[PDB]
Symmetry: D2
Subunit: 372 residues, 4 copies
């Protein structure tokens, strides 16, 4: 498996797994990594929805950042200043839960620009991304104010770009030859959308969560890589969540897209490669779901799980697994100093500061040796 | 290792590893489970700070619920109805970022009561826990309002019991034989605290985070299990983060509790069992840290890592590892069918519901089999 | 998922995963664990062929013991003395490579009786199991003679029971109500067999390796669990091993059991549950293999991987995953240590023993402590 | 951690973890990878002893290849043809058990030269390496003869280079500027040795198994990297193995090198870097072991676990962890395909070949698509 090794001290070429940080991206390539593929129920094996998209022009995007995903994203050895741009298909906790962790973690880890978030309005102010993000920041104001005492705060801001959820395949981002468009989904209530990213001839479709709708088939047409929700079977709804037969049946018809519906939709879309996700990918779930999709779609397919990666070039769409460090550490980028802000009041009172215990004796040993 | 196996078809007794869900609790026993031991920087091997405490009387508590920790908590096979009470030492994202995830995932998973959260206050309203949780609930307002359309809102509420962060060893909860007391910490700004849980003649202390202070050695005195921050060394600060010397030296004296200070602190407390946590536990960091500690403390000592477990009994404090499923699933409890509040208006508009794709034909085949 | 949890302090019942050591086996139940499911090529995710069978009368067998399987087998927390009987289907390294590690490690793990091994003859003496095992013992002469000086050597014998490979469904074992029959396979050269195991109404078939043959369909009919080889596709052969199309094609017609053949065979067998094994079980191989099998067979099917477990009952064959410890240990049994025979030659010379380093000093301190 | 990333589309330099196959080895550099560090008891976390050594001139060696190590070795993505040279410290199963798996597996994976094995003599013929490997090949004669029908048999040979175990730091290998030397150990009986590899001013010492002895401290002196056995504590011996107090005490005195002894030894040796191995490396064992060593040794130290890697250069010896695929595959090297031999009698008799099942019908669908 992999490319043929040509030399003893050389590098293994065309490696059968993706090792994050070890492969150059070419000018006419896209790399998409599934950093979370699962549910609102947590599990170590699948974080919640998150995709990282790296373009050969050097731009990098996050689409969705669900609870748990930060640990996958941080294992990619991408410096935090390259991952400042985040798109949210909707405001379920399992699609934006780890935004806080990107915001706060990315900032101790040396981001120097503000985060930029694109996401959808709702049917009124208090159901859209602008309201959501603004209150999150208040939610974590203790965290914000104490951190800002010691680190310039400009990177701790979040610039939100709220776009109209109702719009039909309209542009919501356009920069440096890259376009994002959105269109709506039908999912729990008004707000959710799907994105399409266009760049240098490629189209990548990030479906989000949805019951089957008429817009995705139209606007995802011809994607190089098309991602869509694909639910666990009604038989698995009974075994796993002990649901009555009637409610089990409805889930795969009213509330969610079934594997059979996914098959029809990808049959319509005709992409170079489809990707089913948002189901628990276990040894006793995955096969029936595959078979349901194959009822109606015959083309290249990926059954998504965490750390799956696609390389999109002219000639091919290649699925591999990424093998990344469990004991991850932040990795530094080329960015430099921002001089801390002198105009920040301490959030300590003298009362607390008087509580300090004397520990000079116990530390004098290591403290002495270290000062060489 | 473990108890002598005596039967061919029986059950291995007193197992060398803890299998969650497999052992009964007994009326004089406490079980403490580290569900996160890490840093604000995320990592598959270490979720951020979380602790689960199950008591002999059937009571359960989460102390801290940092980002990523839910996946570990979920692998315990404890029904969502039994973990409704959560205690926060401080408002840093790595000590309550997964609250939203408990709140949202638990509610979907049939939790029937509201979550209950105790946390400190700050030097003013916008720096304390009641303000944080209030704005957290607004942050996830879309999620709340849409889920509340098909599920009774009562489990979606969160009752916040704020307490004065300045109080010295005062009682903050008192129920069913169980007491918690708080005292202050010295950590980034006013607000952060430690807890001591007292029950049935047991005392268990949760340090949260702090620089060494005079309050912990006093009020933690003779704990069965005492938990305190223990930071990485200054040589490791220079190697892992590329800190210059002066700054690395100070991280361990002014901002954080060094291993040498932790030992001193535990030499004072004289507990049954001491736990160091809040450092990246790796094959190249851990040993120098345990050796800084032993300089000043020689009692029993745990170097915590995720899914480590302590059994408190009269005879001993026993450390084991937990071996849980990575492919976790929610596990049902006793609690009943609490019905939808049918007055709740839908959150869809007709403009969205109007885009449903027709998928009758595609689903006809499996619809028919499942019905018959 | 799993069974309804009924008390805070008690035990979760009918658990969705099998924790080895934590469940009783009932007088009318079979438990089959896959301890290896892989190939002649090694891999942490899949050891080579090995099967553990625990019967409700308290009998235990290993059918095959391929290279790498001991780590999985030793995670079952089964005492070494319960695992003395071993059936080999054939003599490829991936089916008996770990015999020696059972022999040696098991002996130090406690085993007190001889290992006992059943396996087939070949077309001449030097192609059979007696020759094989006897020469393996000579290969490890040094380890055996040196270990025997210190102990009674009885547990280091291996008694081999060779049976004719040509025989059609004849009994090779019959003890305590358990029967085993064998019949032939077509696989590399004369000698490999498949086993049927019968006890208390149940029938479990261990197919081993084989190109498709007339004996399996006949003698495997009506098995509770039928295990058979099921190969990787010809596309995957060209993709992963760079086979030119012609050779890739015949790999699936001449030499191995194709997925479609597997389906045809299990079609004729009509087991309660069929098991496919012996392929690399990766996110990018298993779907085309499953689909191959479903062309021709629609009864219950398992796609094996390591640590899969089947519980067999009158009412059901249930598939679970086992969750067992990676940091496994020797677990002590009832078996009691027997008296040696003061009559074996030492294997040291004095030239060697006169090289001992004087370490008295460096060991004095911890010595002093330990004599408490 | 790691080098600073300089570009969006570029490769992370000096990565904080080692991804096998991804790094060029410099002309004046050695890379040593621990592919097993455990015991004769099997465990997923710790294969039995195995070291892979890669030199900057393109030469590679395996020192020990114990049970279970092959899965780790195979994850390194080195073509079988580059790892034909194997050095055995001694003839315990946990040091050469997986030799049969290198032999068979690498042959079916396009190794085209014979394996070359160096190992010690014993006090008489039947306690040496030559005898041992001769009988290992006979033990697996069914596998050997059936394979040589279809694959050229040359690479199925093992040339054994036996050397005198008694020799005191004498060359046993010399080639292309690379020297291995051996000296005796005291372990179980006469035969075991330790090795030193010398090349290009570097010295790496592979301890093997031994009670403390006068030879290692003298001949390992000034090693760039030195490896020695470091046994579990006597207390851990009573907890984990239930050894009575006196038995547990002599184990660390007469039979093994205690951690305190390790430390004295390394204090004499003064290696640029020391490495302890051959203990179960667990959260509840490692710490006291490390404390043991530091009683007497203060220099750089690693506590070996599986997939740890050392880079040795002129400036530094760096420890890192290797992160490699669990789902491993053979990778092909540059070599010339070896044509078989037709003068090889089949190992099939017609009696078995007459048993083939016809499967043209079940296979006709996929057959047709695949041929076009
Ligand atoms: Zn959603
Ligand atoms: Zn979702
Ligand atoms: Zn904090
Ligand atoms: Zn913290
Ligand atoms: Zn075979
Ligand atoms: Zn095989
Ligand atoms: Zn040995
Ligand atoms: Zn050994």
């Amino acid at each position: 498996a992999g490319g043929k090794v040509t030399s003893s001290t050389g590098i293994a070429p065309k490696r059968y797994v993706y090792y994050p940080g070890s492969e150059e991206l070419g000018p006419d390539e896209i790399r998409v990594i599934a950093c979370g593929t699962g549910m609102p129920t947590a599990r170590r094996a699948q974080a919640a929805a998150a995709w990282v998209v790296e373009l050969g022009n050097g731009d990098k995007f996050i689409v969705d950042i669900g609870s748990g995903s930060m640990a996958n994203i941080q294992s990619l050895m991408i410096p935090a200043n390259y991952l400042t741009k985040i798109f949210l298909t909707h405001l379920h906790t399992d699609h934006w839960g780890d935004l806080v962790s990107m915001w706060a973690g990315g900032w101790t880890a040396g981001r120097t620009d503000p985060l930029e978030v694109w996401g959808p309005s709702g049917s009124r102010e208090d159901m859209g991304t602008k309201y959501a993000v603004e209150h999150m920041l208040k939610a974590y104001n203790w965290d914000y104010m104490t951190r800002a005492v010691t680190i310039n705060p400009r990177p701790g801001d979040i610039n939100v770009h709220e776009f109209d959820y109702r719009a039909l395949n309209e542009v919501v981002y356009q920069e440096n030859g890259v376009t994002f468009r959105s269109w709506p989904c039908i999912h729990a209530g008004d707000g959710p959308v799907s994105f399409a990213l266009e760049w240098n001839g490629y189209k990548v479709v990030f479906g989000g969560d949805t019951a089957p709708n008429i817009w995705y088939p139209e606007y995802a047409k011809g994607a190089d890589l098309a991602i869509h929700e694909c639910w666990m079977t009604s038989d698995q709804m009974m075994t796993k969540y002990n649901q009555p037969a009637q409610l089990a049946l409805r889930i795969n018809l009213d509330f969610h897209t079934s594997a059979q519906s996914f098959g029809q939709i990808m049959n319509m879309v005709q992409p170079r490669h489809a990707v089913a996700y948002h189901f628990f990918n276990d040894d006793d779930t995955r096969y029936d779901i595959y078979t349901g999709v194959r009822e109606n779609y015959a083309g290249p397919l990926s059954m998504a799980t965490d750390m799956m990666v696609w390389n999109i070039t002219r000639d091919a769409v290649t699925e591999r697994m990424a093998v990344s460090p469990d004991h991850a550490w932040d990795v530094a980028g080329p960015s430099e100093d921002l001089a801390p802000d002198r105009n920040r009041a301490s959030e300590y009172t003298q009362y607390i500061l008087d509580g300090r215990l004397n520990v000079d004796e116990a530390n004098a040993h290591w403290k002495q040796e270290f000062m060489g």
